[PDB]
Amino acid sequence: IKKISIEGNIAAGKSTFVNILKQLSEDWEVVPEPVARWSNLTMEQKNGGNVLQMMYEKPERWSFTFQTYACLSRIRAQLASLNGKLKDAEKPVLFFERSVYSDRYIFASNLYESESMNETEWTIYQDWHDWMNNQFGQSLELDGIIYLQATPETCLHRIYLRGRNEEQGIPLEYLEKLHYKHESWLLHRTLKTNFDYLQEVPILTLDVNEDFKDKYESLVEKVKEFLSTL
Amino acid sequence: TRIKKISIEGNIAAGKSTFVNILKQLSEDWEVVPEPVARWSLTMEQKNGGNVLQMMYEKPERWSFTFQTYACLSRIRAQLASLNGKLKDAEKPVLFFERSVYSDRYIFASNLYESESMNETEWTIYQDWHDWMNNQFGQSLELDGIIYLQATPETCLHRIYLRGRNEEQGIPLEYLEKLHYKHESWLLHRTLKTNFDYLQEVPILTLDVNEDFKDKYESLVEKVKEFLSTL
Ligand SMILES: CCCc1sc(-c2ccc(OC)c(OCC(C)(C)O)c2)nc1CSc1cc(N)nc(N)n1
Ligand SMILES: CCCc1sc(-c2ccc(OC)c(OCC(C)(C)O)c2)nc1CSc1cc(N)nc(N)n1
Ligand SMILES: CCCc1sc(-c2ccc(OC)c(OCC(C)(C)O)c2)nc1CSc1cc(N)nc(N)n1
Ligand SMILES: CCCc1sc(-c2ccc(OC)c(OCC(C)(C)O)c2)nc1CSc1cc(N)nc(N)n1
Ligand SMILES: O=c1ccn([C@@H]2O[C@H](COP(=O)(O)OP(=O)(O)O)[C@@H](O)[C@H]2O)c(=O)[nH]1
Ligand SMILES: O=c1ccn([C@@H]2O[C@H](COP(=O)(O)OP(=O)(O)O)[C@@H](O)[C@H]2O)c(=O)[nH]1
């Protein structure tokens, strides 16, 4: 199986793009993001719901707890697909809706930066993150990234389009701060991670500013070519 | 795998470190993994450890969950590493753990849940992580046996009074009964059902360590060497 993580800002179009891909090839399957599932039943998802709501109310009390549980749920859920899926397929591809690196170098790092996590919580999380991925998540190494690039302003409208109730307060500032970090890591590539192979990973950046729900062929053609390059 | 893994279990100040330390010297084939939190009680672990301990003491309701996660992680890292580091050329290698991932959760984390310093979402979340993660290690850290060092709260208090740490001097006798009770259920009556199936069939040796054993441990070790020859 090849592993491709699909990255991008909130409401840039990842769920939608990934649900277009999985429909196109028996060799293509998807791992959605747990935090995504949490946003509306097994024990993980009641913890997910409670913990999500707690995070909305008092993020500086709950950011450490949330981050450690979101990533754990992602690490476990990517494994459920990599060890039990695409058994009878010729050129398997598993497409991750975000990654263990999104968890750390976008969201957790941004919470540390808005002081939702104190120094020690952040230092426990990075050590907890290094070890949890290296003990259990080795097989998760990514063969490439797809960055669905959407201006901060495109994203603000798309949460409006998504018309979810709890997400209309999101200031362009919050959405802009995630954008800058997304730009630094994947486009300008000025971010340093603690993972050496992430320095070299193939990366495909896709301008997803124009809507693509019924005009996505050119985007899908780029993915096919990018995949061949692996 | 060929290394025997034995937990030493006991309440605070029962004398586990004293025992462990005695044991390491009685044989070149006998090795010990000190409990990471006891050390905190200077790497980045000491730094992080140092802080969350003081934060934990300062406010149990805020830091209990964070502390419990890091203590159990730092423990697993000592344990899996000693496996790799010592006893590669021993014909009769035994590794003594100062406590286990079971005491983390079944003594300490449960206690803190029962005392409302972790809410339900933190305790089930903590339990989720412990369950799944120890189940990745199919048999690796899993115990060959357990040695219960059974003392009284008073001895432990008495022994707290002797250990000479003001930072502990205020630990209340009432907390010990609670902790002591949790040990007796798990290690004496065997009524603590857990979610690690092999445990209920892990042999337990119980030693009463109320009598001062420091100059006079030979009996205690005979019972340990007797126990090891049946595992
Ligand atoms: C529903 C998505 C999860 C949430 S909720 C949230 C949030 C909610 C309320 C907040 O204050 C009122 C908030 O403020 C953050 C801040 C005040 C800047 O520290 C963040 N940020 C986030 C982004 S954190 C996140 C998201 C995600 N998908 N994965 C990971 N690992 N972390
Ligand atoms: C992926 C980011 C989700 C975020 S981030 C966020 C947020 C971040 C920073 C903020 O100020 C710095 C913020 O303030 C919103 C406010 C201006 C107070 O209305 C909200 N709100 C949200 C919506 S919180 C939420 C609640 C909920 N129940 N479900 C979901 N999925 N999300
Ligand atoms: C960081 C100091 C260690 C502390 S502090 C502590 C504690 C401190 C103050 C408390 O109330 C003000 C407290 O609440 C008493 C209780 C009845 C649990 O609410 C617990 N319990 C503990 C033992 S936590 C522990 C020890 C250990 N060796 N291993 C693990 N996994 N956890
Ligand atoms: C492994 C420590 C275990 C415990 S448990 C404890 C404690 C727990 C609960 C308590 O009340 C419920 C407690 O007493 C606080 C009180 C007496 C009410 O002010 C102390 N303190 C401690 C140790 S605090 C400590 C210990 C230590 N070795 N070093 C430092 N710097 N701090
Ligand atoms: O080109 C697009 C991409 C997305 N969407 C919609 O915009 C919202 C946000 O997109 P999505 O959930 O895919 O973003 P994600 O958070 O998954 O990146 C959803 O209601 C989608 O149906 C759209 O109308 N056109
Ligand atoms: O036979 C003994 C065993 C222990 N102790 C004392 O009791 C205290 C607690 O011992 P230890 O640190 O070994 O307890 P642990 O927390 O490790 O069980 C220490 O001051 C020991 O010196 C003692 O006087 N005699």
PDB file of C-alpha atoms in Angstrom, chain A residues 43-44 46-48 50-51 54 60-62 64-65 68-69 72-73 75-76 79 116 118-121 123-124 127-128 131-132 135-136, chain B residues 44 47-48 51-52 55 61-63 65-66 69-70 73-74 76-77 80 117 119-122 124-125 127-129 131-133 136-137:
ATOM      1  CA  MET A  43     -16.474   4.372  23.206  1.00  0.00           C
ATOM      2  CA  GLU A  44     -13.937   6.429  21.247  1.00  0.00           C
ATOM      3  CA  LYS A  46     -18.436   9.560  22.986  1.00  0.00           C
ATOM      4  CA  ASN A  47     -15.015  10.526  24.385  1.00  0.00           C
ATOM      5  CA  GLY A  48     -14.481  12.369  21.162  1.00  0.00           C
ATOM      6  CA  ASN A  50     -17.288  15.227  25.129  1.00  0.00           C
ATOM      7  CA  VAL A  51     -13.692  16.118  24.671  1.00  0.00           C
ATOM      8  CA  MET A  54     -14.719  20.680  26.417  1.00  0.00           C
ATOM      9  CA  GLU A  60      -6.293  26.145  27.691  1.00  0.00           C
ATOM     10  CA  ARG A  61      -7.589  23.460  30.108  1.00  0.00           C
ATOM     11  CA  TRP A  62      -8.258  20.846  27.444  1.00  0.00           C
ATOM     12  CA  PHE A  64      -3.273  18.653  25.824  1.00  0.00           C
ATOM     13  CA  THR A  65      -5.989  16.073  26.476  1.00  0.00           C
ATOM     14  CA  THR A  68      -3.208  13.323  22.682  1.00  0.00           C
ATOM     15  CA  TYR A  69      -6.618  11.673  22.047  1.00  0.00           C
ATOM     16  CA  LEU A  72      -4.061   8.330  19.170  1.00  0.00           C
ATOM     17  CA  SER A  73      -7.411   7.880  17.406  1.00  0.00           C
ATOM     18  CA  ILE A  75      -2.780   6.458  14.638  1.00  0.00           C
ATOM     19  CA  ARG A  76      -5.112   3.636  15.601  1.00  0.00           C
ATOM     20  CA  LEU A  79      -3.587   1.117  11.252  1.00  0.00           C
ATOM     21  CA  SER A 116      -3.577  26.950  25.169  1.00  0.00           C
ATOM     22  CA  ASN A 118       2.004  25.517  28.580  1.00  0.00           C
ATOM     23  CA  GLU A 119       5.662  24.697  27.920  1.00  0.00           C
ATOM     24  CA  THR A 120       5.589  21.411  29.845  1.00  0.00           C
ATOM     25  CA  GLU A 121       2.317  20.195  28.269  1.00  0.00           C
ATOM     26  CA  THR A 123       7.168  19.176  25.733  1.00  0.00           C
ATOM     27  CA  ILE A 124       5.187  16.077  27.079  1.00  0.00           C
ATOM     28  CA  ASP A 127       7.966  13.422  23.504  1.00  0.00           C
ATOM     29  CA  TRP A 128       4.596  11.570  23.676  1.00  0.00           C
ATOM     30  CA  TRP A 131       7.423   7.783  20.892  1.00  0.00           C
ATOM     31  CA  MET A 132       3.842   6.855  20.094  1.00  0.00           C
ATOM     32  CA  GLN A 135       6.627   2.454  18.773  1.00  0.00           C
ATOM     33  CA  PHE A 136       3.345   1.907  16.887  1.00  0.00           C
TER      34      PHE A 136
ATOM     35  CA  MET B  44      14.270  16.307  29.777  1.00  0.00           C
ATOM     36  CA  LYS B  47      12.525  18.493  33.698  1.00  0.00           C
ATOM     37  CA  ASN B  48       9.072  17.497  32.478  1.00  0.00           C
ATOM     38  CA  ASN B  51       7.195  20.082  36.752  1.00  0.00           C
ATOM     39  CA  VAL B  52       4.137  17.824  36.339  1.00  0.00           C
ATOM     40  CA  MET B  55       1.854  20.870  39.276  1.00  0.00           C
ATOM     41  CA  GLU B  61      -7.916  18.024  39.551  1.00  0.00           C
ATOM     42  CA  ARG B  62      -6.064  19.823  36.729  1.00  0.00           C
ATOM     43  CA  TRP B  63      -2.958  17.658  36.179  1.00  0.00           C
ATOM     44  CA  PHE B  65      -4.617  12.971  33.698  1.00  0.00           C
ATOM     45  CA  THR B  66      -1.469  14.551  32.273  1.00  0.00           C
ATOM     46  CA  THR B  69      -0.115   9.589  30.903  1.00  0.00           C
ATOM     47  CA  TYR B  70       3.497  10.713  31.194  1.00  0.00           C
ATOM     48  CA  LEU B  73       4.879   6.392  29.213  1.00  0.00           C
ATOM     49  CA  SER B  74       8.139   7.080  30.994  1.00  0.00           C
ATOM     50  CA  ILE B  76       7.131   1.760  29.603  1.00  0.00           C
ATOM     51  CA  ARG B  77      10.312   3.399  28.199  1.00  0.00           C
ATOM     52  CA  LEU B  80      11.314  -1.907  27.229  1.00  0.00           C
ATOM     53  CA  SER B 117      -9.405  14.547  40.291  1.00  0.00           C
ATOM     54  CA  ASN B 119     -13.542  13.262  35.480  1.00  0.00           C
ATOM     55  CA  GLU B 120     -15.150  10.384  33.562  1.00  0.00           C
ATOM     56  CA  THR B 121     -13.940  11.571  30.118  1.00  0.00           C
ATOM     57  CA  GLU B 122     -10.283  11.627  31.349  1.00  0.00           C
ATOM     58  CA  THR B 124     -12.095   6.367  30.065  1.00  0.00           C
ATOM     59  CA  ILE B 125      -9.727   8.243  27.659  1.00  0.00           C
ATOM     60  CA  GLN B 127      -8.165   3.732  29.996  1.00  0.00           C
ATOM     61  CA  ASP B 128      -8.613   3.708  26.193  1.00  0.00           C
ATOM     62  CA  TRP B 129      -4.927   4.542  25.640  1.00  0.00           C
ATOM     63  CA  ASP B 131      -5.750  -0.768  26.868  1.00  0.00           C
ATOM     64  CA  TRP B 132      -4.943  -0.394  23.226  1.00  0.00           C
ATOM     65  CA  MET B 133      -1.265   0.452  23.774  1.00  0.00           C
ATOM     66  CA  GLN B 136       0.275  -3.656  20.914  1.00  0.00           C
ATOM     67  CA  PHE B 137       2.928  -5.312  23.119  1.00  0.00           C
TER      68      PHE B 137
END
